[PDB]
Design an enzyme around this catalytic site. Sequence first.
Site, PDB file in Angstrom:
ATOM      1  N   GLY A 154       2.293   3.218   2.433  1.00 29.12           N
ATOM      2  CA  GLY A 154       1.945   4.240   3.406  1.00 29.12           C
ATOM      3  C   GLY A 154       0.461   4.530   3.527  1.00 29.12           C
ATOM      4  CB  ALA A 155      -2.335   3.784   1.188  1.00 30.11           C
ATOM      5  N   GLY A 189       0.757  -1.242   0.000  1.00 39.58           N
ATOM      6  CA  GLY A 189       0.000   0.000   0.000  1.00 39.58           C
ATOM      7  C   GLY A 189       0.790   1.297   0.000  1.00 39.58           C
ATOM      8  N   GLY A 246      -0.771   2.878   6.551  1.00 42.23           N
ATOM      9  CA  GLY A 246       0.051   3.161   7.715  1.00 42.23           C
ATOM     10  C   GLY A 246       1.007   2.054   8.118  1.00 42.23           C
ATOM     11  CG  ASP A 275      -7.681   1.318   9.540  1.00 39.78           C
ATOM     12  OD1 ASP A 275      -7.118   1.010  10.616  1.00 39.78           O
ATOM     13  OD2 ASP A 275      -7.118   1.217   8.428  1.00 39.78           O
TER      14      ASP A 275
HETATM   15  N1  2A8 Z   1      -6.131  -2.684  10.497  1.00 36.51           N
HETATM   16  C1  2A8 Z   1      -5.071  -3.602  10.680  1.00 36.51           C
HETATM   17  C2  2A8 Z   1      -4.891  -4.228  11.912  1.00 36.51           C
HETATM   18  C3  2A8 Z   1      -3.839  -5.113  12.035  1.00 36.51           C
HETATM   19  C4  2A8 Z   1      -2.987  -5.375  10.978  1.00 36.51           C
HETATM   20  C5  2A8 Z   1      -3.169  -4.746   9.749  1.00 36.51           C
HETATM   21  C6  2A8 Z   1      -4.229  -3.849   9.591  1.00 36.51           C
HETATM   22  N2  2A8 Z   1      -4.510  -3.140   8.348  1.00 36.51           N
HETATM   23  C7  2A8 Z   1      -4.562  -3.810   7.061  1.00 36.51           C
HETATM   24  C8  2A8 Z   1      -4.540  -5.199   6.964  1.00 36.51           C
HETATM   25  C9  2A8 Z   1      -4.583  -5.849   5.731  1.00 36.51           C
HETATM   26  C10 2A8 Z   1      -4.659  -5.072   4.566  1.00 36.51           C
HETATM   27  C11 2A8 Z   1      -4.676  -3.683   4.646  1.00 36.51           C
HETATM   28  C12 2A8 Z   1      -4.632  -3.038   5.896  1.00 36.51           C
HETATM   29  C13 2A8 Z   1      -4.751  -2.637   3.575  1.00 36.51           C
HETATM   30  C14 2A8 Z   1      -5.467  -3.068   2.342  1.00 36.51           C
HETATM   31  C15 2A8 Z   1      -4.549  -3.988   1.635  1.00 36.51           C
HETATM   32  C16 2A8 Z   1      -4.077  -3.426   0.443  1.00 36.51           C
HETATM   33  C17 2A8 Z   1      -3.189  -4.180  -0.329  1.00 36.51           C
HETATM   34  C18 2A8 Z   1      -2.782  -5.447   0.077  1.00 36.51           C
HETATM   35  C19 2A8 Z   1      -3.266  -5.991   1.279  1.00 36.51           C
HETATM   36  C20 2A8 Z   1      -4.168  -5.236   2.055  1.00 36.51           C
HETATM   37  C21 2A8 Z   1      -4.657  -5.923   3.311  1.00 36.51           C
HETATM   38  O1  2A8 Z   1      -4.672  -7.280   3.327  1.00 36.51           O
END
Ligand code: 2A8
Length: 346
Positions: free
Chosen positions: A38-39, A36, A41, A173
């Site tokens: 940085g998108a 991602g 975090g 989120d």
């Molecule tokens: N919220 C939290 C809590 C604990 C750990 C991690 C996260 N946040 C996460 C978790 C998984 C993914 C994404 C954000 C972003 C979207 C994304 C985009 C591209 C490839 C994979 C994923 C994806 O699986």
Amino acid sequence: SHMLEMSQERPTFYRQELNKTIWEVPERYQNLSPVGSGAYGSVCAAFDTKTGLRVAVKKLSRPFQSIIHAKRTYRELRLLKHMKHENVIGLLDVFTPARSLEEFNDVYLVTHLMGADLNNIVKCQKLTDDHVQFLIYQILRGLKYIHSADIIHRDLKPSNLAVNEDCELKILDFGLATRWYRAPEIMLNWMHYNQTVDIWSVGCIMAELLTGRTLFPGTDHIDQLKLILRLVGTPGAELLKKISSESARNYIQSLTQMPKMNFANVFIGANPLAVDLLEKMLVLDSDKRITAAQALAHAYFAQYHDPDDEPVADPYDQSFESRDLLIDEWKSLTYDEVISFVPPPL
Ligand SMILES: Nc1ccccc1Nc1ccc2c(c1)CCc1ccccc1C2=O
């Protein structure tokens, strides 16, 4: 049965550079790479050698920067530890390289890897009506669970929805393209709103999945409102008597009066059941807006709906929210939550 552990071993950690910084994680996690950019975090995909699956690992490196940050970190961790539902991002693990509270600084969170957000999905394909039914069904199933715990998302949007290649979806989120999905009552804070702010967002997302384009692409707050009123119609007098902000009422009354548009003329070629559901979601009166539980029972979801398989959450004790504490106190509470984490079974 009565045998207890008298001690426990810390996992072995290793260090590496990722995103121009050092990540220090248990040897359990291998082959990390950023996703991602940085998108989302500081999130890396990894191979979890314990569960034998791909995971997403999110690093928090400024969780205790201020009182506001520290309380948010605590809130997010308590939330994530509570959420246990197929359509809500929950925790496989949470860890810190720190051996004591004294050396505690970074928090890492681990969840199942999905592989995309709904934005990416929409860009890469025109979704069929079946895809849309399934994706929206899962959002609503997740929201029923979240809402039943007295939690509101508040910022639901395609980038907060993780989707995998099997069209499975999880909500990511929780809050509190940025304004396009926000309920009007919270855009210009009309009132102490309710849980159906999230349903407005679902309606906006569903519309976009159906048409392939943003429903209300406003350029600013006022423009956004104008676009909304053009579809749903100018609210009546009694709807105004329910909102509190005198500034809001005054302005909207200066606008040209508009009747509710015909939704069949906007969502062309869409399943009529989809259109009917949109009409129940995209209403200004939050006291009239359909709930997640009501929406799940709507005929549009006949193929997926199973009242026996749409669980609710355990009550969620948010009494901590009323406390006013120092950074070190929020940090200590958070540390306690890290070390007390109990992983899901294998
Ligand atoms: N919220 C939290 C809590 C604990 C750990 C991690 C996260 N946040 C996460 C978790 C998984 C993914 C994404 C954000 C972003 C979207 C994304 C985009 C591209 C490839 C994979 C994923 C994806 O699986």
